[PDB]
């Protein structure tokens, strides 16, 4: 139901817009509105399906 | 309930239309409307059933 | 609730009609209408029960 | 909730009537109407309980 | 919710009446009406609790 | 929700009354009415909790 | 939701009253009324939590 | 939803009042009323969390 | 949904007030009212998360 | 749905306010009101996600 | 449904605003309102997906 | 107005149905409904007319 | 008000119809309907007036 | 109209449920409800018809 | 219709609660309410059926 | 229906309160109100069940 | 308005009925109903007027 | 109007029920409901009339 | 009408809940609600009846 | 009805909040609202029960 995004670099954008600096962690749940989440920049994502590394 | 698409190359299309560049990651939930998702180009998909690599 | 079809060859048909080219991946959920899905051609399917290879 | 039938030979019948050729794969969900599914001929079935081989 | 009966010999009866020949496989779900299923003859049954061999 | 009774000998009674011969298999679901099932004679029962052998 | 009692000796009482002879097996579901089950005598009980041996 | 109490000694009290003799087994479900169960004396309890031995 | 408290010493208090002597075991479910349970004295608690030893 | 806090030192505060002494254990469920719990001082917490040690 | 944040350094901010000092632990559930939680500073987070370390 | 039945052996039936084990004693009064009492097995009966020994 | 019939042989009839086997004992009260009781076969009767032996 | 039960051993049950310890004496009258009284364990009963010793 | 209890020792309890000292005698009639009388301690009871000695 | 109390010593109390001196005799009937009679001191009681000597 | 009764021996009666054992202390206030208090046995009473020793 | 009870030993009961451990002090006022207070165990009581020591 | 509690040690609890540190003094009046006050830990209490020292 | 607090040091808090400097004296009466008064810091209190020294 929720994802965990650790921003490994500054200015990481999360759309669905929010900006994160280096070292912050955003835990985001899916609402009715937020049905899709796009991640730019270098970040480390943990979902239910496992982990992944956006660049 | 949701899929994770890491676009390994530029111009990856996701239909159900959105375009992704290299290194971005789209986490997509299934709405009532979006009942099917088609992925073109080279991308790395994680679902509940496991991982797969579209080309 | 959903299946993952990676089309390993061109012109793979999915009925319930859609056509896929080589390398694309279709993630399909079951609606009320779509109660049966038929797959032609060479494709690689992941379901909840495991994987299978249609030819 | 659904079964996966890979038709290993031509003319495989699925009742509940549909016909499959060799190499096709039918993913069938149970509706209210379809409460029983009979499979003739040589086919390879995956259910939640495991796999089986009809002849 | 459903059982898988592979008829290992001809004339296998399934009550709740249907008849199966050798090599066929019947996947049967429980409705409101079908609250009990009786199997005669030599057959190989897979349920959620495991497998069994009726004779 | 359901039990599987393989009658290992003739005349096995199932109350909640039905009679089974040797080699038959009865798959019984619990209705609102059938809240208790008594098994006489030599039979082999599979439930969710495991297997047991009535005599 | 249900328990399995194999009566290992004659006259096993089950309260919530029923009597069992040696070798019988009673599969009992919990209704709204039957909220507690007491077992006397030598019997072998399988529940969801495991097995136990009343004496 | 339910607990299993094997009374290892005579006069075991179960409050929420009932008395058990040595060798009996009480399987108790939680109603709306019975929201707490106290066990005195030497008894052997199986719950969902595991086993324990009251004295 | 419920906790198991074995009182290893006399006068163990359970608030949410009840008192237990040495060797007793209280199995407590959470109602709407009882939303917090405090345990004093030496006791051995089993929850869903595991075991713990209050002093 | 609930957390287990063993207060390893005196005066441990739990906000959402309650105070605990050394050796006590508070098992706290989440109501509608209590949507966040803050723990001060040296305490040992067990949740569903595992254990942790507040200082 | 809930996350566990151990603040490893002083002044850790949790948005969705609260401030934590070193050694405190905040257990936060997701309401309807709190649909996203941002964590600044050095903290140690446990979720259902595992652990992570914000900086 | 009442009879006294000492069950000298196990499984003594009293109709008007109840079962008694060895050593138990049932004191039964005549209601409007219970106008006849039948005793099977080995038992020792005391009535107003004297004593008798059913076998 | 009541009689005690010990059936000393099989098939003893009691009219007012019931059948008794050897060793059974029937204690019969007089209703408004049952104003006369006829006993066939070998039986041993105790009434208020004493004992008698029907053949 | 009433019976006298001297409990010669501990835990004597009287159904119609009450428990007696060794040396206690229960004098029980027959109500409209209590139309049958069953005595377990070792006890010494005095009725109008005489005395008896349950075991 | 009534019983006579001579309390041979102090603190004799009569339930149905009253307390008697040594040497007192309680003559108790059965009301509609008092349908059962339990006697603890050492006492000497005279009923219509005879005498008895509770301990 | 009535008891006879000869007061063998002064100050004998009869509750259900009356006081008797030495040598007096009280013949007491049971009303609806007086359902229990307690006798203190040294007295000699005659009932229907026989005689007794309170002290 | 209130009295203090320390029961120096067992079975001390307080009427207005209650029983006390040795070492207990009853602090009794005067209601509208309790307008007189009688104390039997050996006890030590403190009132507003001073102390006294009942025997 | 109020009493002061210092519990000199563990498990001191105060009826009118509360339990106290060693070293605690309960200051109790008389309500309309609490018209009598009984103290068990070893405790030290101060009233308006002076002090006393329950055992 | 009021009591004076000087907390001689840290964490002194006053129920009727409040916590006091060493050296603080709480002057508490009795409301309608607060009809009983329990004091834990080492504290020095002055009432109208005198002084006392809880531990 | 009233207390006298001489603040022997600066910043003495009186809750029920007011602050006092060194040498000031606050005479406080109990209203309906102010039912409890807490004193921090070094102060010298005179009540009806005597004097005390908060620290
Ligand atoms: Au594009
Ligand atoms: Au065909
Ligand atoms: Au039986
Ligand atoms: Au206690
Ligand atoms: Au801050
Ligand atoms: Au008992
Ligand atoms: Au008198
Ligand atoms: Au007493
Ligand atoms: Au505290």
Curated annotation (Swiss-Prot), chains A, B, C, D, E, F, G, H, I, J, K, L, M, N, O, P, Q, R, S, T:
Oligomer of 11 identical subunits arranged in doughnut-like structure. The keyword RNA-binding applies. Keywords: RNA-binding, Transcription, Transcription regulation. SUPFAM superfamilies: TRAP-like (SSF51219). It comes from Geobacillus stearothermophilus (Bacillus stearothermophilus). This is Transcription attenuation protein MtrB. Belongs to the MtrB family. One of its GO terms (molecular function) is RNA binding. GO terms for biological process: DNA-templated transcription termination; regulation of DNA-templated transcription. The keyword Transmembrane helix does not apply. Required for transcription attenuation control in the Trp operon. This trans-acting factor seems to recognize a 10 bases nucleotide sequence in the Trp leader transcript causing transcription termination. Binds the leader RNA only in presence of L-tryptophan. InterPro entries: MtrB, Trp_RNA-bd_attenuator-like_dom, Trp_RNA-bd_attenuator_dom. The gene is mtrB.
């Amino acid at each position: 139901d929720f994802v965990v995004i650790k921003a490994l670099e500054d200015g990481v954008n999360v759309i669905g817009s929010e900006c994160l600096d280096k070292g912050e962690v955003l835990i985001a749940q899916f609402t009715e509105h937020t049905s899709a989440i796009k991640v730019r920049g270098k970040a480390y994502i943990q979902t239910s399906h496992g982990v992944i590394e956006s660049e």
